[PDB]
């Protein structure tokens, strides 16, 4: 072949760049917000007398 034996496969390509972006880049804030709501619901039920 006469060149490097490595192959690059990006997931979401970046304009004029090698490394792509995974799905975790866009969902950073959404996961944190969702986690806060779930913990709040459990705390309301868990700490309540029953």
């Amino acid at each position: 072949d006469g060149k490097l034996p490595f192959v690059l496969i990006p997931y979401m390509p970046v304009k004029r760049d090698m490394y792509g972006e995974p799905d975790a880049e866009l969902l950073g804030d959404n996961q944190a917000v969702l986690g806060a709501v779930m913990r709040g619901m459990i705390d309301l039920l868990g700490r309540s007398a029953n």
Partner: protein, 236 residues
Amino acid sequence: MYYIEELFCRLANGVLNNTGIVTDDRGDIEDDSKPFIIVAANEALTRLHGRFNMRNNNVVVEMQEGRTNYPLLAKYAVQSYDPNEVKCPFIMDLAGEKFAEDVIRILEVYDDKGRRRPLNDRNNPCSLFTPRPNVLQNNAPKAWEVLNVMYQAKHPKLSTAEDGYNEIDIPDTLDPALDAYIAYRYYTSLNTPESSAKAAEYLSFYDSICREVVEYDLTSDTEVDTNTLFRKRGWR
């Protein structure tokens, strides 16, 4: 903290300033009328320590074989028991901190091994029982079982005798409440209708002071703690 003499001066130059039981110089109450104030003063202190959980004191009780009921009386204390009729005391105290039977309400009991003992739990075989407010009953006295009882305590009873207590240890914000109750007792004793109206004013004033303390929580009566049922219930 201050001596009972300062209380006499404060009453002399206070609510009782216009009474016939004070000295000509308004410096002290009449000596023959002193026991009247002492009886009222002890009664007033009991009411304050009941509504407000100000003093929390603990005592040590040693289990004795063949005995189930353990009254919390000074005659069973090591520093005050009579060997003639008591084989051995089971209430342990110090020479300078003699037990004074100041028990009002039992709060919690812990054994010598650090395990909490339930009280008045009829369905629990190992629970303790209190047939009387100042009597502790154990249904299974072991060999080396020693119990510590933490309870709400009243102020020690005042006495004009030298060996007796002659100091007052209460929050200074409750001093007007103490004076009002003593004034109420004195004016209520007089049966003249004019004094009756004055007596009611002090009693109402005493109640107003107590609720004001509760409203602002000046004695740290309210208590909270971190939640533990969350872990025990397994919510995770």
